[PDB]
Structure formats: C-alpha cells, structure tokens
Write a protein that holds these residues in place. Sequence first.
Motif, mmCIF file in Angstrom:
data_model
loop_
_atom_site.group_PDB
_atom_site.id
_atom_site.type_symbol
_atom_site.label_atom_id
_atom_site.label_comp_id
_atom_site.label_asym_id
_atom_site.label_seq_id
_atom_site.Cartn_x
_atom_site.Cartn_y
_atom_site.Cartn_z
ATOM 1 N N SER A 132 10.353 -4.373 -5.973
ATOM 2 C CA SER A 132 9.006 -3.877 -5.857
ATOM 3 C C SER A 132 8.101 -5.075 -5.778
ATOM 4 N N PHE A 133 6.816 -4.819 -5.589
ATOM 5 C CA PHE A 133 5.890 -5.906 -5.470
ATOM 6 C C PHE A 133 4.530 -5.540 -6.025
ATOM 7 N N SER A 134 3.772 -6.592 -6.286
ATOM 8 C CA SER A 134 2.459 -6.500 -6.888
ATOM 9 C C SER A 134 1.388 -6.392 -5.831
ATOM 10 N N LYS A 135 0.144 -6.241 -6.269
ATOM 11 C CA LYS A 135 -0.951 -6.006 -5.351
ATOM 12 C C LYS A 135 -1.148 -7.179 -4.409
ATOM 13 N N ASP A 136 -0.736 -8.372 -4.831
ATOM 14 C CA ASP A 136 -0.808 -9.540 -3.956
ATOM 15 C C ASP A 136 0.433 -9.709 -3.078
ATOM 16 N N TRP A 137 1.281 -8.681 -3.067
ATOM 17 C CA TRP A 137 2.487 -8.635 -2.237
ATOM 18 C C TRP A 137 3.639 -9.454 -2.762
ATOM 19 N N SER A 138 3.459 -10.148 -3.872
ATOM 20 C CA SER A 138 4.567 -10.896 -4.408
ATOM 21 C C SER A 138 5.528 -9.941 -5.095
ATOM 22 N N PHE A 139 6.802 -10.302 -5.052
ATOM 23 C CA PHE A 139 7.853 -9.439 -5.551
ATOM 24 C C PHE A 139 8.096 -9.625 -7.013
ATOM 25 N N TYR A 140 8.688 -8.613 -7.623
ATOM 26 C CA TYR A 140 9.164 -8.743 -8.979
ATOM 27 C C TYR A 140 10.449 -7.966 -9.148
ATOM 28 N N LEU A 141 11.297 -8.481 -10.026
ATOM 29 C CA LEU A 141 12.563 -7.884 -10.385
ATOM 30 C C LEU A 141 12.845 -8.164 -11.826
ATOM 31 N N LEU A 142 13.459 -7.189 -12.469
ATOM 32 C CA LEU A 142 13.979 -7.373 -13.797
ATOM 33 C C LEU A 142 15.502 -7.394 -13.748
ATOM 34 N N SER B 117 13.642 -15.144 9.302
ATOM 35 C CA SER B 117 13.590 -13.975 8.438
ATOM 36 C C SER B 117 12.133 -13.677 8.113
ATOM 37 N N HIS B 118 11.758 -12.415 8.243
ATOM 38 C CA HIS B 118 10.382 -11.991 8.006
ATOM 39 C C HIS B 118 10.367 -10.736 7.196
ATOM 40 N N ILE B 119 9.207 -10.430 6.631
ATOM 41 C CA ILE B 119 9.079 -9.304 5.738
ATOM 42 C C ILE B 119 7.813 -8.512 6.020
ATOM 43 N N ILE B 120 7.963 -7.209 6.174
ATOM 44 C CA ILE B 120 6.816 -6.320 6.177
ATOM 45 C C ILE B 120 6.826 -5.586 4.871
ATOM 46 N N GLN B 121 5.661 -5.517 4.231
ATOM 47 C CA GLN B 121 5.491 -4.674 3.084
ATOM 48 C C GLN B 121 4.410 -3.666 3.332
ATOM 49 N N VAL B 122 4.579 -2.507 2.727
ATOM 50 C CA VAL B 122 3.628 -1.440 2.882
ATOM 51 C C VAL B 122 3.401 -0.832 1.534
ATOM 52 N N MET B 123 2.152 -0.484 1.261
ATOM 53 C CA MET B 123 1.831 0.335 0.126
ATOM 54 C C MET B 123 1.051 1.548 0.590
ATOM 55 N N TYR B 124 1.364 2.672 -0.029
ATOM 56 C CA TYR B 124 0.591 3.900 0.113
ATOM 57 C C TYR B 124 0.265 4.342 -1.269
ATOM 58 N N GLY B 125 -0.896 4.954 -1.443
ATOM 59 C CA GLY B 125 -1.239 5.392 -2.761
ATOM 60 C C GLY B 125 -2.387 6.351 -2.800
ATOM 61 N N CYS B 126 -2.372 7.203 -3.798
ATOM 62 C CA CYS B 126 -3.552 7.991 -4.083
ATOM 63 C C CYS B 126 -3.808 7.890 -5.555
ATOM 64 N N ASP B 127 -5.085 7.825 -5.900
ATOM 65 C CA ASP B 127 -5.540 7.779 -7.263
ATOM 66 C C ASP B 127 -6.293 9.055 -7.494
ATOM 67 N N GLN C 131 -2.010 0.039 2.715
ATOM 68 C CA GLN C 131 -2.131 -1.354 3.096
ATOM 69 C C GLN C 131 -0.808 -1.891 3.577
ATOM 70 N N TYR C 132 -0.887 -2.881 4.452
ATOM 71 C CA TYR C 132 0.292 -3.473 5.067
ATOM 72 C C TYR C 132 0.175 -4.955 4.949
ATOM 73 N N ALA C 133 1.314 -5.611 4.795
ATOM 74 C CA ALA C 133 1.397 -7.051 4.797
ATOM 75 C C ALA C 133 2.530 -7.512 5.679
ATOM 76 N N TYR C 134 2.394 -8.713 6.190
ATOM 77 C CA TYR C 134 3.449 -9.341 6.954
ATOM 78 C C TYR C 134 3.634 -10.704 6.351
ATOM 79 N N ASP C 135 4.872 -11.014 5.978
ATOM 80 C CA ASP C 135 5.233 -12.268 5.328
ATOM 81 C C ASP C 135 4.334 -12.542 4.154
ATOM 82 N N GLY C 136 4.007 -11.457 3.457
ATOM 83 C CA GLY C 136 3.304 -11.538 2.186
ATOM 84 C C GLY C 136 1.810 -11.697 2.304
ATOM 85 N N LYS C 137 1.295 -11.596 3.520
ATOM 86 C CA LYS C 137 -0.137 -11.766 3.785
ATOM 87 C C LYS C 137 -0.674 -10.444 4.270
#
Lengths: 99, 9, 274
Positions: free
Chosen positions: A55-65, C92-102, C115-121
């Motif tokens: 999983s990852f944090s709001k800054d996109w960095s990953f975390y693992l336990l 090697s590259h990484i896409i991350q995605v978050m979806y959420g409702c509060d 929100q979406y990120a590519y290579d952590g950005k």
Amino acid sequence: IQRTPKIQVYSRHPAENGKSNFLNCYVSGFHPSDIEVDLLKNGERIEKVEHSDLSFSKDWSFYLLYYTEFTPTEKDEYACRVNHVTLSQPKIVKWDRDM
Amino acid sequence: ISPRTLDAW
Amino acid sequence: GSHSMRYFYTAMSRPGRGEPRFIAVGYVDDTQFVRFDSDAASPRMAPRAPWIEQEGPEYWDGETRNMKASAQTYRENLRIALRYYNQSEAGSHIIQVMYGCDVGPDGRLLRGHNQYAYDGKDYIALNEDLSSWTAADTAAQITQRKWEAARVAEQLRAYLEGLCVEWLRRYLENGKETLQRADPPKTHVTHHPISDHEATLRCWALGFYPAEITLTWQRDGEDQTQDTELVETRPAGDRTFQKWAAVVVPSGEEQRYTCHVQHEGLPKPLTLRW
C-alpha cells in the motif's frame, strides 16, 4: 527520483522475555516498491516471515509491514535487514525494545 | 466496492 | 464520526520478468479489507478483514473480474505513460491510483477523491468538484483532454457519490464493531538517560485505532514542535497503531514537560508527565 525506506523495528506488544510476541519491521516512505526485507535472529534469516499487502501513503510512497512470531529473550538479538534500490548495501536496523 | 471506471491514459 | 473508503492500486512494470504486477488494496478508514495481487498463483480479490468475508460469490467474482480488468488497463496505462514521457521499454515504472470517498457521521458524501501518480509523482487528479481535472504536467494534460472528451469525470463522480458512499455505508454497518470503534491509545512516558545532564522522555501511544493521533510535548506549556522527535505512526499488526514522541530534556527538568495526546477515542485530550 527515488525514495529510501524508513525502517522501524519493534514488537507488537511491550517486550517481555520468554513471552511470545510479534517482531515487526515496518518499512515506509520508499519508492519504487521492490524491497527485500529479512528479519534476523542472531544474524540468521528467520524463515517464517510474513508481510502486509503493498500500500502507499498520500505522497505515493510505499509501506509494508514484515512480521514474525518471536519469543524475545535477554540474549537473542533481532534485526531487520532491508535492501532497496536506493541502498548500496542492505541496511540493518537492530530491534531496540525501547523504541 | 472497487470502481469499474477503467480509463486509458 | 466521519469515515472513508479508499482503493489503492499499484501497477509495476518489470521488463524481462513478465507483465507488470498489479496489486490493489481496499481500506475503510485504517482497516484493509481486500487485496488483489496479479502475481498470486490464483489471483483473486481476497478478503483481509472479517466483516467483508460475508460478501457473496458475486461480490468476490465481480471484484476479481474488475481487478483483472483493472490490471489490464493499468498495464496499458504503463505502456501509454512510456510514450507520453518518451521513455524506454527497458525501464521499470509504476502507476499508482487512489480512489476514495469521505462521508460524515450521517453517511453523506463529504468529498470524493481520485488521484493518479506515475513513478511516484502526481500525474492527474479529479478536482473536488468531481467534474474537472488537475493535470500535473503536459503528459497528464493529454490524459486530461482524453478524459474531458470522454466525460470520464462524470463516471467517476457517479461512483464516488453513489456506489462508493453506499458500499462504504454498508461496510461500516457490517464492520461496525471494529470500524466504528475507536481504541484509545494506551499512553505512558518513559525516561532514558543519555548522559549525566540529559535524558530522553518518550511519550508512547499504543494500541490505538484509528491511526490519526496527535502527540505533542510541551515545555512550560509551550509546544516543542522543533525539538520533538516524532516517529511515524506504525502498525502493530493487530489492527492498532503505535507512535511515540520524544524530547531530550535537561536532567531534573522532567516536570516542565507534558505530553499531550489527542485521539478520537479519548473523550478529552490527555496530558501526561514522567
């Protein structure tokens, strides 16, 4: 642009010698996601180690336990050995029962 | 439940 | 009080070692409840909290299907991103995605997130209006244009206002014993001499849920923000979290320091001393 893991090694419960516990190594703040984490007992790799789902944090960095059942004693040394692309050599963080 | 919104970049 | 649901996807290319790995996890608040890993011997959306287990086979098969499809979409998006950034197929590259409702205490949507990120950005994000986009760069503007043209935001808004909120409400009910239970921190202050005239006071918070917590040290009623070592809140492995805050204090001055603990599970903020 890569991010090196933060590493915390700690137990699930306050350490009590001779009492079963869980040894945790929490790696976080890293990017990219590939990471090698070993839990060490007296320098030796513990076989029975599990980890959380990536999983990852709001800054996109990953975390693992990473975690294993362990029974802490006075003499036994525990450590977490972490390798990541950001590290030239594996970082060993020793378990300190007061942190 | 996971979103089914599958959008190509 | 308020609650959130999040899905997090990570798609990781690895040229020469097969197709990009796709890992998805779902959370309600700080409780993971599902996972999917395309590298599993038999990839499926799998339960990771007891209260989701009751969901029927249609749920699991539907989620598994959606995850496999999402994996495919994100593998494609990885290839697209290579183009958009003029990158080699060797890296090697990484896409991350978050979806959420509060949602608020009454279950009403407070806000949606995608929100979406590519290579952590940051790459692109749905704005709070759930209608418009913020693109981080000219590559993401290409995606933005595509998504504006295809009215993607509307579909996302539909999910975030609808199913996301509705299923969150359901999970909250099904998991109420845990999801709607705050476990307050168990707090104590330890003292660790460093030298003859300094010691560390470490204020501990253990066994708490959810993760959000504020630990602060005051000296003479003044926040010691700059002088406090605050470790990242960390999971204990039993659902709860731990955190500590430490200050280095002059020997004999320990009583000038107070640790202040704010957590949702506390009826009032706690003040602790050594």
